[PDB]
């Protein structure tokens, strides 16, 4: 005669009424959050991700003589706002063309995020390295940041497309490689301009950034700006000349000046200043692999990733070229980042012939009995020598342990069941002890005892 | 405006008289 | 392929529409990015039918939202799984409905429904064959109950060819949400009849009852009673969205479940329903869901589906099982309680299959009711309205926006006709 | 060597591959069948893409192209050297690429 | 030289259609994929698979079949199905919208704007044919498209090729166990439709496979998938005898002057033997003797109607096997001694026999196991006045006020067709009745 | 959290799931020469596949007595002339074909 919904309630730790069921409940959040995890999908864990990969911090090389020559590194610092630029990999614009969004950041620390590389664009006549005022360079960022290069371009005014809230330029981290990523330096003092031209650039001096398919001076502004990575501002491609009509054609007729020299001042929102350096676990990290990799194959993930590499070396030696190695894991897609590769690849830099055993593990001796015995019923079957072409026709399709709750066609399993084995000739031989192996690894994802054991049970008439 | 009257649009009623005639004539023969 | 495309209003119909997206995203594996990430392959043979296409790959599904207000619409998409609307599709006016019908109808639903008919023509037509329309809507509120009516005759008139169902909460007698639910409610009711092809009533009074003698959970939000209905819909598009034996489109029920022209008011329920605690212990056998499928509270209905006969009703059960078994425990619920069906009409069951059961379950029943029951609610609904008429209480403000006496005794007055006309068939005789 | 391939016919035939592809479904259509081809088999969902399985696939949509060709277009289509593509990119320079 | 052509139209049928080209296609060594697997060659002086395929030059054979719904989900299902590449790729005519279960919405309304269509696709393929022996057509006439196109093919067919004869395999709804309610009108019209345009047809009611499945089978949870091999084996006993080399042979052209006494009287059922497992099979007797006594057990009729409430008029069974002549003529003599089976009066002999000399062939995963010995009988017999009895009661009661009428009138059709249809029962129910008399 | 995916139709006959990266490529080259087209069948080559190489029996040659056919036909007055001459006919066109060669899964199809 229990009567629930007893107005006062405790909690369900209590027993005063209505606790048989709402305590699961608490279990079964309890029992679901074992499962997010699993597959690496629970915000917390990327968000390090997002937050780790962007925090890293940078080292700016340093400046020999305080001449600005291709390949250093620079931070981009705004003098209005006494900030510099910032990226963000994550942030996407909207359109057919894949791109990502930049800001200012008031922090001053260079970081990873801010590094640019700086590279000759296009060839010109100058020999030596010394950049040249008027001349074409273009900026890349780390390659840390992202895999692929990346490259920051913008287009001309349109409704359709418009800054997110400076309703200027549009500027955007894209994948082009043409027109809209050159760039050139002007100077500031407007007396000096035309004459700029020919004279080396001076690390530190202001600098003056101009957009080669605008002709826009880019520069920053203040306005909000709202992102993960704390308060910035954004930075939109705008040149801000002085209001004030200057009378160029009166001026021009009588002729006593020129196109090429400027006639209006500009404010202080488009100077910029290029700014050089200040002065001159194991454990843990193999289990990732073998879980991403669970996933994407599902018990059988392993072999096929060992499957997968074999067909990129040829000559058995073990020793592959490191960078060979990063497009395997990218060619087989699991949700491993591209963060995480390099701390395997430099952990046995001098290897994957090594590599492999550690995913292998060790298991308990509970199993290797189960896993020898049966090859003893298939040797009295096959008798003294045993072929690959008995073992495929040995295999017993119609019970296993998928078919029985009908999850695939035998077709699927029988199939699936011969890719695992490798690139064998079908003429080989192969002993029962290579025997012991090959089940060794399709033990070591399976977690769960009891279908493991009942794939061997079943699956060769093992009584 | 109440229309719920069912005691009985009499056409219809009148062919069904005929419908089961013949069904009895073909029943009787 | 038969589309269909889906139109509510008010936040009532608002709140409900928001959970079918998700639920039906979920089983079309479509995330709240939207980037199909599919297992089988059968999970898109009939993407389209209710999903578009977009060029970069994501699906933005067709709907139509809007509401008299924007507080309600500012917080549906609010929340995660909002951003699959297209924002064109939305429609919001700065009035507000404030419980009186005739703001909604005439003087501001006027002044706003030209707008909406705009935008469902171009979806409507967009669709290679058009195979229906489904509106969920409440008639106890303000925007939905008002609106819904007025864009329901307009549309039909447009298309007299395609089917049309609807999805209401009628107020319940025990817990009371608005003082003027009665007056707006039977306006409503009776603009149904008319225009719409079928309707399947659905009542929050068996949503609390039911969350707490076979769920067990104290502390139910209402995420938990949407989540129910949500899946209620689900399962009547089942067949049309997958393969199976013996497919059942929206049509199809309606030429097998509605007997007469003005006989065509449903009420479905969900099974099987077991709490967390018993989430294991039953066996998940044909026998098991026959039983609660008709059990007297597993209905969704306020009615009580024991106290007449059955006229017609139709089983679409999902996911793979025998057939043999589905038509044999037909049969005998059919015999055993003969007295609580209809005798003149035989074989008065319906049945119905799908190849695909809902996700995380291995066997699935959505019933349709058509009982001479339903008219329970209705002497409900019409004896309240009878003596709040009585003392013109809340009339002066009806007819203040050009609403006269002249529809309110019409409007009741086939209520009533309604109720009668359909009992008489509950003692009628062969 | 028998002769280099020109630009005009790597120009030619990749006109016979951007037509065609029209040809199918509605004229919305032809990119949802495009992401078919890499859904419709592959263990990887990498999306990347292998020189061997482009002729595959473009051996299956009614263009007998010879191996040759084949080379030469691959090479012209991928710039990293590598002879990988991923479909984010390779797509975007099918359909929604202003020039020829 | 002789070929038949193949009419599906109807879940009912389009799925028994799915299932009946199976066991042809395994019987004649043709695989699945379409290529047969040669090793056949040498002057192959036999064109065993003309009497259903047609020869593709080199390899392949295109199945004369015609595909018909007005529905794409189960039309296309077969064409991403393990079928995909033997059926010819427009071959497969598939309509928009479904029937809904309204016979009106398929006789007057849609169905006209496709029939065209189908008229047009047996146009092309009979021409290829060219001693065309008849027609077979499956059809479910308790559902909505069924009827619709049934009914309206069956009308156009008549009137283009007219002496050429047609069996049609109908499936009415069971005494008791069925699924549409609405289902007694849809089915009555249809049977005005074909009973003047189709000489011979056979009841299959669903509800006896049940019992017939239960009682020996022994499967207590059966589904469609298993209900239709024993269907599609009727086929496969019935159009063998084209096919294969006989003592006795017995052809198409020997039903509509061999078992129909009257051209208004032309309904009969069928029955099927031996019905045993692949674990019960082999400890038993099967011999002539034996099948052919099981042959006319009540209960195991494929029809819910028992033969032992009226006479028979004429049976012809077909036997398939290795059956010895004189053993037939063994079981006959026995069966017309016993009493419980009575003849009429002016009927003499009402047998015809037949003589195959091909074992039939089991479908490899199902029930039905391998044996040596079989027979497929059908009768014409007055039994079957029980099941237009039993569907009329059912109908004339909910007619009586109108339910469910709207639907059918609202879309064209007279409301007066519903009074001779039922005239239509009136009549056959009384000639069935006056045949049965003594003379 | 699963969504099965096996339709009545496939789990009777099959689902393919075939097609593998090579695949293609090499029915590629079988129509490269592959022409789809047919002649006329060259008449009187049509007909019946036998089953017997007897007239109105089946010749089931078995150790059984009761299906020995030629111990079953000695009742004649004399050594049947049919039986003999059959029998020959079975043995010579089997060394035919071995000279040839094409065991199609039985003598009877030669
Ligand atoms: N035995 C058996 N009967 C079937 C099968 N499929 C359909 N039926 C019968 O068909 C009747 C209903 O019609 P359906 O075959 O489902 O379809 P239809 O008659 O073409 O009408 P629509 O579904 O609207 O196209 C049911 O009452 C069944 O008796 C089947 O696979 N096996
Ligand atoms: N059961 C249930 N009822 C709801 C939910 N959301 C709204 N309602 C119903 O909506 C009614 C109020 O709607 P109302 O604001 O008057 O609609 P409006 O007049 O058109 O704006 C209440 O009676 C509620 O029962 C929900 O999530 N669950
Ligand atoms: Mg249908």
């Given at each position: 005669?229990?009567?629930?919904?007893?107005?006062r309630?405790?909690?369900?730790?209590?027993?005063?009424?209505?606790?048989?069921?709402?305590?699961?409940?608490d279990?079964?959040?309890?029992?679901?959050?074992?499962?997010?995890?699993?597959?690496?999908?629970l915000?917390?864990?990327?968000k390090?991700?997002?937050?780790?990969?962007?925090?890293?911090?940078?080292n700016?090389?340093?400046?020999?003589?305080?001449?600005v020559?291709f390949?250093?590194?620079?931070?981009?610092?705004s003098?209005?706002?006494?900030?510099?630029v910032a990226?963000?990999?994550?942030?996407?614009?909207?359109?057919?063309?894949?791109?990502?969004?930049?800001?200012?950041?008031?922090?001053?620390?260079?970081?990873?995020?801010?590094?640019?590389?700086?590279?000759?664009?296009?060839?010109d006549?100058?020999?030596?390295?010394?950049?040249?005022y008027?001349?074409?360079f273009?900026?890349?960022?780390?390659?840390?940041?992202?895999?692929?290069?990346?490259?920051?371009?913008?287009?001309?005014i349109?409704?359709?497309?418009?800054?997110?809230?400076?309703?200027?330029?549009?500027?955007?981290?894209?994948?082009?490689?043409g027109?809209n990523?050159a760039?050139?330096?002007?100077?500031?003092?407007?007396?000096?301009?035309?004459?700029?031209?020919?004279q080396?650039?001076?690390?530190?001096?202001?600098?003056?950034?101009?957009?080669?398919?605008?002709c826009?001076?880019?520069?920053?502004?203040?306005?909000?700006?709202?992102?993960?990575?704390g308060?910035?501002?954004?930075?939109?491609?705008?040149?801000?000349?002085?209001?004030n009509?200057?009378?160029?054609?009166?001026?021009?007729?009588?002729?006593?000046?020129?196109?090429?020299?400027?006639?209006?001042?500009?404010?202080?929102?488009?100077?910029?200043?290029?700014?050089?350096?200040?002065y001159?676990?194991?454990?843990?990290?193999?289990?990732?692999?073998?879980?991403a990799?669970?996933?994407?194959?599902?018990?059988?993930?392993?072999?096929?990733?060992?499957?997968?590499?074999?067909?990129?070396?040829?000559?058995?030696?073990?020793?592959?070229?490191?960078?060979?190695?990063?497009?395997?894991?990218?060619?087989?897609?699991?949700?491993?980042?591209?963060?995480?590769?390099?701390?395997?690849?430099?952990?046995?830099?001098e290897?994957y012939?090594?590599?492999?055993?550690?995913?292998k593990?060790?298991?308990?001796?509970?199993?290797?009995?189960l896993?020898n015995?049966?090859?003893?019923?298939?040797?009295?079957?096959?008798?003294?020598?045993?072929?690959?072409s008995?073992?495929?026709?040995?295999?017993?399709?119609?019970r296993?342990?998928?078919?029985?709750?009908?999850?695939?066609?035998?077709?699927?399993?029988?199939?699936?069941?011969?890719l695992?084995?490798?690139?064998?000739?079908?003429?080989?031989?192969?002993?029962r002890?290579?025997?012991?192996?090959?089940?060794?690894?399709?033990?070591?994802?399976?977690?769960k005892?009891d279908?493991?054991?009942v794939?061997?049970?079943?699956?060769?008439?093992?009584? | 405006?109440?229309?719920?009257?069912?005691?009985?649009?009499?056409?219809?009623?009148?062919?069904?008289?005929?419908?089961?005639?013949?069904?009895?004539?073909?029943?009787?023969? | 392929?038969?589309?269909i495309?889906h139109?509510?209003?008010?936040?009532?119909?608002?709140?409900?529409?928001a959970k079918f997206?998700?639920?039906?995203?979920?089983?079309?594996?479509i995330?709240?990015?939207?980037?199909?990430?599919?297992?089988?392959?059968?999970q898109?043979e009939?993407?389209?039918?209710?999903?578009?296409?977009?060029?970069?790959?994501?699906?933005?599904?067709?709907?139509?939202?809007?509401?008299?207000?924007?507080?309600?619409?500012?917080?549906?998409?609010?929340?995660?799984?909002?951003?699959?609307?297209?924002?064109?599709?939305?429609?919001?006016?700065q009035?507000?409905?404030?419980?009186?019908?005739?703001k909604?109808?005439?003087?501001?639903?006027?002044?706003?429904?030209?707008?909406?008919?705009?935008?469902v023509?171009?979806?409507?037509?967009?669709?290679?064959?058009?195979?229906?329309?489904?509106?969920?809507?409440?008639?106890?509120?303000?925007?939905?109950?008002?609106?819904?009516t007025?864009?329901?005759?307009?549309?039909?008139?447009?298309?007299?060819?395609?089917?049309?169902?609807?999805?209401?909460?009628?107020?319940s007698?025990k817990?009371?949400?608005?003082?003027?639910?009665?007056?707006?409610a039977?306006?409503?009711?009776?603009?149904?009849?008319?225009?719409?092809?079928?309707?399947?009533?659905?009542?929050?009074?068996?949503?609390?009852?039911?969350?707490?003698?076979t769920?067990?959970?104290?502390?139910?939000?209402?995420?938990?009673?949407?989540?129910l209905?949500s899946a209620?819909?689900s399962?009547?598009?089942?067949?049309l969205?997958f393969?199976?034996?013996?497919?059942?489109?929206?049509?199809?029920?309606?030429?097998?479940?509605?007997?007469?022209?003005?006989?065509?008011?449903?009420?479905?329920?969900?099974?099987?329903?077991?709490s967390?605690?018993?989430?294991?212990?039953?066996?998940?056998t044909?026998?098991?869901?026959?039983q609660?499928?008709?059990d007297?509270?597993?209905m969704?209905?306020?009615?009580?589906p024991?106290?007449?006969?059955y006229?017609?009703?139709?089983?679409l059960?999902?996911?793979?099982?025998?057939?043999?078994?589905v038509?044999?425990?037909?049969?005998?619920?059919?015999?055993?309680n003969?007295?609580?069906?209809?005798?003149?009409?035989?074989?008065?069951?319906?049945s119905?299959?799908?190849?695909?059961?809902?996700?995380?379950?291995?066997?699935?029943?959505?019933?349709?009711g058509?009982?001479?029951?339903?008219?329970?609610?209705?002497?409900?609904?019409?004896?309240?309205?009878?003596?709040?008429?009585?003392?013109?209480?809340?009339?002066?403000?009806?007819?203040?926006?050009?609403?006269?006496?002249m529809?309110?005794?019409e409007?009741?007055?086939?209520?009533?006709?309604?109720?009668?006309?359909?009992?008489?068939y509950?003692?009628?005789?062969? | 060597?028998?002769l280099?391939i020109?630009?005009?016919?790597?120009?030619?035939?990749?006109?016979?591959?951007?037509?065609?592809?029209?040809?199918?479904?509605?004229?919305?259509?032809?990119?949802?069948?495009?992401?078919?081809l890499?859904?419709?088999?592959?263990?990887?969902?990498?999306?990347?893409?292998?020189?061997?399985?482009?002729?595959?696939?473009?051996?299956?949509?009614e263009?007998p192209?010879?191996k040759?060709?084949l080379?030469?277009?691959?090479?012209?289509?991928?710039?990293?050297?590598?002879?990988?593509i991923?479909?984010?990119?390779?797509?975007?320079?099918?359909?929604?690429?202003?020039?020829? | 030289?002789?070929?038949?052509?193949?009419?599906?139209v109807?879940?009912?049928?389009?799925?028994?259609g799915?299932?009946?080209?199976?066991?042809?296609?395994?019987?004649?060594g043709?695989?699945?994929d379409?290529?047969?697997?040669?090793?056949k060659?040498?002057?192959?002086?036999?064109?065993?698979?003309?009497?259903?395929?047609?020869?593709?030059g080199?390899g392949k054979?295109?199945?004369?079949?015609?595909?018909?719904?007005?529905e794409?989900?189960?039309?296309?299902?077969?064409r991403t199905?393990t079928?995909?590449?033997?059926?010819?790729?427009?071959?497969?005519?598939?309509?928009?919208?479904d029937?809904?279960?309204?016979?009106?919405?398929?006789?007057?309304?849609?169905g006209?704007?496709?029939?065209?269509?189908c008229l047009?696709?047996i146009?092309?393929?009979?021409?290829?044919?060219?001693?065309?022996?008849?027609?077979?057509?499956?059809?479910?006439?308790?559902?909505?498209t069924?009827?619709?196109?049934?009914?309206?093919?069956?009308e156009?067919?008549?009137?283009?090729?007219?002496?050429?004869?047609?069996?049609g395999?109908?499936?009415?709804?069971?005494?008791?166990?069925?699924?549409?309610?609405?289902?007694?009108?849809?089915?009555?019209?249809?049977?005005?439709?074909?009973?003047?345009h189709?000489?011979?047809?056979?009841?299959?009611?669903?509800?006896?496979?049940?019992?017939?499945?239960?009682?020996?089978?022994?499967?207590?949870?059966?589904?469609?998938?298993?209900?239709?091999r024993?269907?599609?084996?009727?086929?496969?006993?019935?159009?063998?005898?084209?096919?294969?080399?006989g003592?006795?042979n017995?052809?198409?052209?020997?039903?509509?002057?061999?078992?129909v006494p009257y051209?208004?009287?032309?309904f009969?059922?069928?029955?099927?033997?031996?019905?045993?497992?692949?674990?019960?099979?082999?400890?038993?007797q099967?011999?002539?003797?034996?099948?052919?006594?099981?042959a006319?057990?009540?209960?195991?009729?494929?029809?819910?109607?028992?033969?032992?409430?009226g006479?028979?008029?004429?049976?012809?069974?077909?036997?398939?096997?290795?059956v010895?002549?004189?053993?037939?003529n063994?079981?006959?003599?026995?069966?017309?001694?016993?009493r419980?089976?009575?003849?009429?009066?002016?009927?003499?002999?009402?047998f015809?026999?037949?003589?195959?000399?091909q074992?039939?062939?089991?479908?490899?995963?199902?029930?039905?196991?391998?044996?040596?010995?079989?027979?497929?009988?059908?009768?014409?017999?007055?039994?079957?006045?029980?099941?237009?009895?039993?569907?009329?009661?059912?109908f004339?009661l909910?007619?009586?006020?109108?339910?469910?009428?709207?639907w059918?009138?609202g879309?064209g059709?007279?409301?007066?067709?519903?009074?001779?249809?039922?005239?239509?029962?009136?009549?056959?129910?009384?000639?069935?009745?006056?045949?049965?008399?003594?003379? | 959290?699963?969504?099965?995916?096996?339709?009545?139709?496939?789990?009777?006959f099959?689902?393919?799931?075939?097609?593998?990266?090579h695949?293609?490529?090499?029915?590629?080259?079988?129509?490269?020469?592959?022409?789809?087209?047919?002649?006329?069948?060259?008449?009187?080559?049509?007909?019946?596949?036998?089953?017997?190489?007897?007239?109105?029996?089946?010749?089931?040659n078995?150790?059984?007595?009761?299906?020995?056919?030629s111990?079953?036909?000695?009742?004649?007055?004399?050594?049947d002339?049919?039986?003999?001459?059959?029998?020959?006919?079975?043995?010579?066109?089997?060394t035919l074909?071995?000279?040839?060669?094409?065991?199609?899964?039985?003598?009877?199809?030669?």
């Open positions: 005669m229990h009567n629930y919904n007893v107005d309630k405790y909690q369900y730790n209590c027993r005063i009424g209505n606790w048989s069921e709402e305590w699961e409940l279990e079964y959040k309890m029992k679901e959050y074992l499962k997010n995890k699993e597959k690496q999908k915000v917390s864990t990327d390090e991700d997002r937050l780790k990969r962007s925090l890293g911090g940078v700016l090389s340093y400046a020999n003589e305080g001449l020559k390949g250093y590194t620079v931070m981009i610092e003098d209005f706002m006494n900030a510099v990226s963000n990999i994550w942030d996407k614009i909207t359109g057919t063309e894949e791109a990502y969004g930049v800001t200012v950041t008031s922090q001053k620390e260079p970081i990873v995020r801010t590094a640019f590389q700086l590279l000759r664009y296009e060839q006549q100058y020999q030596d390295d010394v950049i040249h008027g001349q074409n273009k900026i890349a960022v780390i390659s840390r940041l992202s895999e692929k290069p990346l490259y920051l371009t913008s287009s001309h349109t409704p359709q497309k418009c800054a997110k809230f400076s309703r200027k330029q549009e500027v955007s981290i894209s994948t082009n490689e027109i990523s760039w050139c330096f002007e100077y500031m003092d407007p007396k000096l301009r035309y004459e700029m031209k020919g080396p650039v001076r690390s530190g001096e202001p600098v003056l950034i101009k957009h080669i398919p605008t826009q001076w880019l520069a920053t502004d203040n306005v909000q700006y709202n992102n993960e990575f308060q910035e501002f954004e930075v939109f491609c705008n040149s801000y000349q002085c209001h009509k200057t009378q160029n054609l009166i001026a021009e007729k009588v002729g006593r000046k020129t196109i090429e020299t400027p006639m209006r001042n500009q404010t202080n929102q488009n100077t910029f200043r290029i700014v050089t350096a200040l001159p676990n194991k454990a843990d990290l193999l289990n990732k692999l073998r879980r990799l669970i996933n994407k194959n599902g018990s059988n993930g392993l072999l096929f990733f060992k499957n997968e590499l074999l067909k990129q070396d040829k000559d058995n030696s073990g020793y592959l070229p490191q960078q060979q190695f990063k497009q395997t894991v990218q060619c087989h897609g699991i949700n491993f980042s591209d963060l995480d590769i390099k701390e395997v690849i430099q952990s046995f830099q290897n012939s090594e590599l492999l055993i550690q995913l593990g060790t298991l308990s001796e509970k199993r290797r009995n896993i015995l049966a090859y003893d019923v298939l040797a009295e079957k096959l008798g003294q020598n045993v072929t690959l008995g073992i495929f026709s040995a295999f017993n399709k119609i296993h342990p998928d078919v029985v709750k009908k999850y695939g066609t035998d077709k699927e399993i029988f199939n699936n069941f011969v695992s084995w490798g690139n064998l000739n079908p003429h080989i031989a192969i002993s002890e290579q025997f012991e192996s090959y089940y060794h690894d399709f033990s070591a994802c399976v977690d005892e279908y493991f054991e794939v061997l049970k079943n699956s060769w008439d093992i009584p | 405006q109440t229309a719920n009257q069912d005691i009985g649009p009499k056409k219809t009623c009148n062919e069904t008289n005929y419908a089961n005639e013949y069904y009895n004539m073909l029943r009787v023969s | 392929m038969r589309e495309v139109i509510q209003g008010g936040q009532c119909g608002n709140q409900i529409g997206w998700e639920v039906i995203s979920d089983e079309h594996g995330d709240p990015t939207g980037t199909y990430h599919g297992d089988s392959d059968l898109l009939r993407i389209n039918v209710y999903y578009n296409e977009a060029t970069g790959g994501r699906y933005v599904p067709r709907a139509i939202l809007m509401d008299l207000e924007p507080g309600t619409m500012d917080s549906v998409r609010a929340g995660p799984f909002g951003q699959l609307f297209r924002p064109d599709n939305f429609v919001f006016g009035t507000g409905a404030g419980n009186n019908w005739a909604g109808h005439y003087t501001e639903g006027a002044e706003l429904i030209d707008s909406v008919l705009d935008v023509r171009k979806e409507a037509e967009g669709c290679d064959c058009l195979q229906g329309f489904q509106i969920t809507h409440s008639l106890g509120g303000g925007t939905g109950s008002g609106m819904g007025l864009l329901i005759s307009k549309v039909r008139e447009e298309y007299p060819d395609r089917i049309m169902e609807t999805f209401s909460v009628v107020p007698p817990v009371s949400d608005t003082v003027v639910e009665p007056y707006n039977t306006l409503s009711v009776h603009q149904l009849v008319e225009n719409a092809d079928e309707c399947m009533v659905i009542d929050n009074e068996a949503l609390y009852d039911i969350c707490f003698r769920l067990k959970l104290t502390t139910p939000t209402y995420g938990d009673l949407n989540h209905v209620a819909m399962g009547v598009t089942c067949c969205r393969p199976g034996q013996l497919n059942s489109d929206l049509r199809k029920l309606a030429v097998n479940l509605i007997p007469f022209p003005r006989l065509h008011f449903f009420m479905i329920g969900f099974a099987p329903l077991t967390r605690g018993s989430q294991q212990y039953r066996a998940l044909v026998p098991e869901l026959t609660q499928m008709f007297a509270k597993n969704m209905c306020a009615a009580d024991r106290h007449g006969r006229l017609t009703a139709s089983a059960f999902r996911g793979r099982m025998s057939t043999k078994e038509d044999e425990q037909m049969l005998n619920v059919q015999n055993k003969s007295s609580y069906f209809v005798e003149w009409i035989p074989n008065n069951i319906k119905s299959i799908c190849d695909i059961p809902p996700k995380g379950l291995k066997m699935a029943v959505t019933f349709v058509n009982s001479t029951a339903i008219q329970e609610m209705f002497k409900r609904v019409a004896e309240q309205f009878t003596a709040m008429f009585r003392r013109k209480a809340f009339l002066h403000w009806y007819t203040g926006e050009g609403m006269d006496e529809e309110f005794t409007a009741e007055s086939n209520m009533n006709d309604l109720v009668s006309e359909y009992q008489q509950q003692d009628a005789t062969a | 060597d028998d280099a020109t630009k005009e016919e790597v120009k030619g035939i990749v006109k016979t591959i951007r037509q065609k592809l029209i040809q199918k479904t509605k004229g919305a259509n032809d990119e949802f069948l495009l992401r078919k890499f859904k419709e088999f592959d263990i990887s969902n990498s999306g990347f893409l292998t020189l061997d399985e482009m002729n595959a696939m473009l051996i299956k949509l263009i192209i010879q040759r060709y080379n030469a277009v691959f090479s012209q289509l991928d710039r990293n050297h590598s002879g990988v991923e479909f984010e990119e390779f797509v975007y320079y099918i359909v929604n690429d202003p020039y020829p | 030289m002789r070929e038949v052509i193949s009419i599906h109807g879940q009912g049928g389009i799925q028994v799915n299932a009946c080209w199976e066991l042809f296609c395994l019987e004649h043709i695989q699945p379409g290529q047969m697997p040669s090793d060659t040498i002057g192959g002086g036999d064109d065993a698979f003309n009497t259903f395929f047609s020869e593709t080199a054979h295109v199945p004369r079949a015609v595909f018909l719904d007005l794409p989900t189960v039309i296309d299902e077969v199905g079928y995909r590449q033997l059926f010819h790729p427009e071959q497969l005519i598939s309509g928009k919208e029937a809904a279960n309204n016979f009106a919405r398929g006789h007057y309304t849609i006209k704007e496709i029939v065209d269509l047009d696709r146009r092309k393929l009979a021409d290829n044919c060219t001693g065309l022996q008849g027609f077979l057509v499956f059809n479910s006439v308790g559902g909505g069924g009827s619709g196109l049934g009914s309206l093919l069956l156009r067919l008549s009137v283009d090729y007219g002496k050429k004869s047609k069996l395999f109908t499936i009415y709804p069971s005494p008791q166990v069925s699924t549409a309610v609405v289902e007694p009108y849809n089915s009555i019209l249809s049977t005005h439709s074909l009973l003047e189709t000489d011979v047809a056979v009841m299959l009611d669903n509800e006896a496979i049940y019992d017939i499945c239960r009682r020996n089978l022994d499967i207590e949870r059966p589904t469609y998938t298993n209900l239709n024993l269907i599609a084996q009727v086929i496969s006993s019935l159009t063998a005898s084209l096919r294969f080399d003592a006795l017995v052809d198409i052209t020997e039903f509509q002057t061999n078992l051209p208004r009287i032309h009969m059922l069928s029955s099927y033997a031996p019905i045993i497992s692949a674990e019960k099979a082999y400890h038993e099967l011999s002539v003797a034996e099948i052919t006594n099981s006319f057990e009540p209960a195991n009729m494929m029809a819910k109607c028992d033969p032992r409430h006479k028979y008029m004429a049976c012809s069974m077909m036997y398939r096997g290795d010895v002549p004189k053993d037939v063994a079981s006959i003599a026995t069966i017309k001694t016993k419980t089976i009575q003849f009429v009066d002016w009927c003499p002999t009402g015809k026999v037949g003589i195959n000399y074992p039939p062939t089991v479908v490899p995963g199902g029930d039905l196991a391998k044996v040596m010995r079989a027979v497929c009988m059908i009768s014409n017999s007055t039994a079957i006045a029980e099941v237009f009895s039993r569907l009329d009661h059912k004339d909910m007619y009586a006020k109108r339910a469910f009428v709207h059918y009138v879309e059709m007279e409301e007066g067709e519903f009074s001779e249809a039922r005239e239509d029962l009136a009549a056959l129910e009384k000639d069935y009745e006056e045949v049965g008399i003594e003379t | 959290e699963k969504f099965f995916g096996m339709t009545t139709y496939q789990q009777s099959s689902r393919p799931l075939k097609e593998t990266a695949q293609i490529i090499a029915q590629s080259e079988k129509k490269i020469n592959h022409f789809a087209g047919t002649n006329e069948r060259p008449v009187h080559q049509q007909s019946t596949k036998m089953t017997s190489v007897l007239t109105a029996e089946k010749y089931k078995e150790q059984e007595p009761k299906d020995n056919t111990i079953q036909r000695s009742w004649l007055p004399y050594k002339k049919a039986l003999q001459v059959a029998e020959n006919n079975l043995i010579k066109n089997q074909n071995q000279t040839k060669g094409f065991t199609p899964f039985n003598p009877l199809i030669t």
